[PDB]
Amino acid sequence: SLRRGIYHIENAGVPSAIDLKDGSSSDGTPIVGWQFTPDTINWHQLWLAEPIPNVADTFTLCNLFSGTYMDLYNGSSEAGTAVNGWQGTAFTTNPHQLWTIKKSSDGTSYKIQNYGSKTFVDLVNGDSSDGAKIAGWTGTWDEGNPHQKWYFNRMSVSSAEAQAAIARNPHIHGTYRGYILDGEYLVLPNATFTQIWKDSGLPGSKWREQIYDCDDFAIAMKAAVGKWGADSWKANGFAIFCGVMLGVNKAGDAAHAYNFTLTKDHADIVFFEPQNGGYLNDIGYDSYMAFY
Template sequence: MWVIKSVSRESDTYTIRNMVGGTYMSLTGSATNGTAIVGSQQAGDNQKWIIKKGTRSDMTYSRIQNKGNRSFIDLAGGAGANGTKVLGWQSTWDDSNTNQRWNFSSQSLTSAEVRTALDANPYLRSDFKSFVSDGMYLILSQARYQEIWRNSGLQSRRWREEVFDCDDFSFVYKGEVGKWGDSQFKATGFGILCGIMFGSSKQGAHAYNWMVKSGNHANIEFFEPQDNTFKDDPGYSAYFGVY
């Protein structure tokens, strides 16, 4: 996965940073066809990329051109094997070469997009209030969230009134998600979505976690940190949340 960030005051221009390694996609100063694209620390125009939609009838793909030497990102030979090199290649924006066509799949949401998903959920009260701490959020799969829980030590904890009850489970789990991200990724500029909600029902009050579904990014789901389960209906109407 990559963090794609726009460059201030430069139209259609971005940096492309590897999330795990933290280095930026870079092309050396050479414009020679076949020049290797590598990861390096941010330095200048060789780490800046112009990203635009195709100019032919097929507008579903994008092309990526290096700002420094104007070469395009090319998948060597169009091969589909793991380890195929990605190279710089001279071309034009209307070239039909499929080796230089790229599609992007967003794995993140802005805080405003997360709020839109929240507002559409029926299990929030009309007076629901929330506190936002980050501007961009990575959305994980259910399987990943559950793996983090299994490695958190929470399964050995038991509910104890006031001492370690539902809100403590929720805050500790949110912290564990953050710790996992800190260990996994060297890139910065994003948070990992794991919210906390406080809700009420006729039976009483409860605290639990929530996330946006990784499939469509349009709906939220609820997570019980006491037993590692997901629910579409938490059984409570939320009046306050953080994320």
């Protein structure tokens, strides 16, 4: 089954993602095919899949930016029926906004079926143009038709996945304790993580003994990523990944506070130095505490 989380949904035939046009919150905003840039935030192209309890493999799909839901217009089963953003709720009973999502016949891409109509999300004609129509269309679960096949490129980690990335790391102290704050996290590209650091004003901050030292930099960076999350996205039910760690050096006679993020493959953590914006695989300390 597709896991709860945030997805960049990319057509299997052409490099077009499912895009809520101009990120508009208006009811009936077209959802279209649009080109995308890897290792960026694709602002109009992120979808929070929320599993419906007791209805197998069936989800709402909420646009992270707009906070509006992928909606089959009037739930029509006619081929070519508009797929739009529409106001709704994460556990709606409105079948216009319920989507059964299961693996295609290629075992890697998915098909997206409207729960009400039993028609499929279709990039009409496989058109690769920016703003190409996406519609509900007749189809089958088993057929090869790439118009109706969608890679769910996973952009978020569970707290369990983040816990596993930390536990893999070779710089964890024997006394380590980790404190988990949320359930599902958007993983940022380093380019975005860096931009939030810059926009916080931290690059201008001076180290001062106790009054603005390592712990102040690390906590300011976590607060800044928190603020950016709330200020940037209209959807609820996820957080932004940014960790704080306290570490101790090999000699056991010096400690340091810093941040950490996750690799592109979500398998490992990377240390971030909020005093200079560096990324490091080894920051010269082993973590004895994290909160994220």
